[PDB]
Amino acid sequence: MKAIAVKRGEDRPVVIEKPRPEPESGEALVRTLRVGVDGTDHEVIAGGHGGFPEGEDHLVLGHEAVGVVVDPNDTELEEGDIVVPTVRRPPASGTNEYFERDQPDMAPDGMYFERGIVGAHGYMSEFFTSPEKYLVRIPRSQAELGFLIEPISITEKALEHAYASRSAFDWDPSSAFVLGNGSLGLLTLAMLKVDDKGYENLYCLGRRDRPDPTIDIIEELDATYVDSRQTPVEDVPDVYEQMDFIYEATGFPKHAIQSVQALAPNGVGALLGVPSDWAFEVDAGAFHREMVLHNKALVGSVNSHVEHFEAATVTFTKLPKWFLEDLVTGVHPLSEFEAAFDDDDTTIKTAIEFSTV
Amino acid sequence: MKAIAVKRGEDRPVVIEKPRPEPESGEALVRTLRVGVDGTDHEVIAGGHGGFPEGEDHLVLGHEAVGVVVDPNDTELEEGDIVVPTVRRPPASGTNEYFERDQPDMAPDGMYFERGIVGAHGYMSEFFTSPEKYLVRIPRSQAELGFLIEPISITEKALEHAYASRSAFDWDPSSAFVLGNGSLGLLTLAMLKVDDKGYENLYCLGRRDRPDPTIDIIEELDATYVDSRQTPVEDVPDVYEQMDFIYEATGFPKHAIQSVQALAPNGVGALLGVPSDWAFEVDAGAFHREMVLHNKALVGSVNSHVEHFEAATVTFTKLPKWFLEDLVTGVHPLSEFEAAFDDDDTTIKTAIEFSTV
Ligand SMILES: NC(=O)c1ccc[n+]([C@@H]2O[C@H](COP(=O)([O-])OP(=O)(O)OC[C@H]3O[C@@H](n4cnc5c(N)ncnc54)[C@H](OP(=O)(O)O)[C@@H]3O)[C@@H](O)[C@H]2O)c1
């Protein structure tokens, strides 16, 4: 079968040929339909974040997949089920408490693999296998955009933990601010629009000049676009308002610290970005004091698990159809796969189509 | 009646004479028994934190009080009830949502007074009044050390919010690290010893040379004393272990940032300290990345309300008697009140006794 991989010490993604996998007991064989590309694939291509599987000359890319079950083997899935795989798998050494208690999304560094990211091959191949417990059935009509279920689930987890931090009191937020206008930030902005907490005012931070299709999406969602070149995060409360909820999806360390100054009293910031080490001068006193005197919280979140994937299928149904059309800027057949990795300002979310139906 | 106050633009606390207050409808008249002194009284004496009531030449100090109801007026309290007052009261402008929904502890700056701290006179007077809804009945046998109920309640709130942040997954902590060996840190260390989460290893940070009575308390509680001069917070995981729970009670901004590096995966830091502005170089990248990749949380907490005072009465009963004897280094009659404000390394918690029975 054909797969898209990065080979050791090489620049670009290439097609390689590999044997079709055979499922072991408890695994289904899945025929890949579409696989999404995000920053991590780019990040993994260049070098930073992730790592190749031991003893292998390459890494099959892709962690956002949808496929059709072609051989259910000895599992309780049915031939033709549309499934989305979770990303985390047990490490080489074997199972651990995080997997045994069904919360692999909470496993620390070195106690998990992430398919297509660290230690294990991804899903950009014509077929793959997985244990039934890590394959989530989704409605058949979500198959075409099913690679979006994984990123939606990332936000479903982050919101769950962020909201739990505010559960000891009566919190009624009215404003939310998403930092970043990438595919995660934009998806999140749309989710916040339909969130049960009933946000009235939405804001999204970016740094683009008009005309720009990400600005258009933000404003078409009835949110306010904030240019960070004109209004840094710290200054937002003066120009606009204090924000009850902040969701950080920029990967810019200054935002993690500065968001505390933009939070309303009793607010919470969710941090999703993954930056490199970067040292600079901060007023730690102001950070510390705001957190305490105004009962604020910061919560970090990574990955997601089955329950968040399931929740994502419901959220998906609530998202406007125009939004999904504008977010996915290209789906490319395997024959033209290189186009899926071209990044420019007009490219938002791409995917590669391996097969149909 | 006699009161202990700081007069405008003066150095020291002094005795003033004031008329006995009369309770309005819904208020009881309370005869003060004992009032504790903490950092905030010292901080309020010198100048920083707090503010005098409008149009007044002085501030009656003290926010940690226990008293006996002498006139229940038209309330449902009974003559001779032992009560502890809460600290927050509505501001000059009048009530607001935080008070109406019974969560004044969540009110932002300018939407509350704090008796003995900002905008309203404290409890270091022979008598005071309060609304029945802000007077918490406690067991009669807790009257002698009843000024401890307020600081215990501070921790009851912080633990509630910190623990709520971890409620979306199965968290089973085994290690806890208290930063600071002041009266709040030491009380908190004792509370963690009897906490239902079942901590196995306890640690407390300070910077004292032996012999020192705070080191003795820490070690007598079977905790490990960590000298920050030898082992900074960031280095603790190498020398000892990663900490599931950190409670910050130093007021030192570096600790708010560095505690993220000492947290175990999935851990939470509670921040209680109130520092001044202070700017310095931090690796914000390392802070940001640890928070995200290891699903960590930081939660700030200030003040407390009725339910936390009630919980404190149960916690009090579980604290070892030796600990309470060693923590309270002096109770001073009104005649020798100045001694209650002397601070040195051998002084831990003091109180002033206004009356008995
Ligand atoms: N925690 C998790 O499980 C998880 C999952 C997915 C992604 N992530 C992380 O989340 C972040 C976002 O992911 P993504 O797929 O949306 O990535 P992305 O495509 O790179 O989006 C990041 C966006 O942030 C904007 N940005 C960066 N710095 C900015 C600044 N200073 N002011 C305003 N905008 C700024 C960028 O704008 P420009 O293009 O104009 O530079 C870009 O559009 C990344 O750090 C990624 O690693 C974490």
Ligand SMILES: NC(=O)c1ccc[n+]([C@@H]2O[C@H](COP(=O)([O-])OP(=O)(O)OC[C@H]3O[C@@H](n4cnc5c(N)ncnc54)[C@H](OP(=O)(O)O)[C@@H]3O)[C@@H](O)[C@H]2O)c1
């Ligand atoms: N959030 C709230 O509702 C609330 C309530 C009460 C108190 N607080 C705050 O909580 C903090 C503690 O209160 P407290 O009554 O216990 O105050 P405290 O009596 O001043 O205790 C602070 C302790 O921290 C130690 N400390 C300071 N810097 C240190 C460092 N770098 N390394 C090791 N130890 C250090 C001090 O040691 P040394 O004596 O050796 O200098 C002191 O013993 C204060 O900031 C106070 O404002 C907040």
Ligand SMILES: [Zn+2]
């Ligand atoms: Zn993804």
Ligand SMILES: [Zn+2]
């Ligand atoms: Zn106090």
